[PDB]
């Protein structure tokens, strides 16, 4: 049934809503964790615990000159 005839095959598609929700959720959580750890490590940092930069680093609070512009204005529109 293989000497003279050939038909193509494809890769296994994952159309499952559960695992797609899990993949998108975990990728969003991982990229936002990586972004916040990178921004807390390359700037001024605070800490809830004494000398705690590796675990739970906080980006330090900087004052704005005009705070209503960064508060009230929408960024995605």
């Amino acid at each position: 049934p293989h000497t003279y005839i050939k038909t193509p095959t494809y890769r296994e598609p994952v159309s499952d809503y559960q695992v797609l929700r899990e993949k998108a959720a975990s990728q969003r959580r991982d990229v936002e964790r990586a972004l916040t750890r990178f921004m807390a490590k390359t700037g001024e940092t605070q800490s809830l615990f004494k000398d705690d930069v590796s675990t739970f680093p906080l980006i330090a609070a900087r004052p704005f000159t005009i705070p209503y512009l960064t508060a009230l204005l929408p960024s995605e529109l």
Partner: protein, 91 residues
């Protein structure tokens, strides 16, 4: 211009929009396969994975820039193609 590599485009400021015998290269004659020998160690959908057709088939060697000034052809900006064959990409 606005896609990945926009930073490079902005920095540039462009705004539109016998030793060649086949055997020498067979990996029996180019690989320390001795290290592999283990001494005293201690299908309706595809069964096998699908390889990158561009790596397996394309002549990527044509994107090597051998001489910057004397470049045999003219290269063009590359658009992002988002291959969906790769898993780990949501779409």
């Amino acid at each position: 211009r606005y896609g990945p590599a926009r930073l490079w485009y902005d920095m540039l400021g462009v705004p539109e929009d016998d030793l060649l015998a086949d055997e020498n290269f067979l990996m029996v004659t180019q690989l320390h396969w001795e290290d592999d020998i283990i001494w005293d160690g201690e299908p309706w959908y595809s069964i096998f994975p699908i390889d990158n057709e561009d790596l397996v088939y394309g002549r990527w060697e044509d994107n090597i820039i051998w001489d910057a000034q004397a470049m045999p052809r003219l290269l063009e900006p590359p658009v992002l193609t988002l291959d969906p064959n790769d898993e780990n990409l949501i779409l």
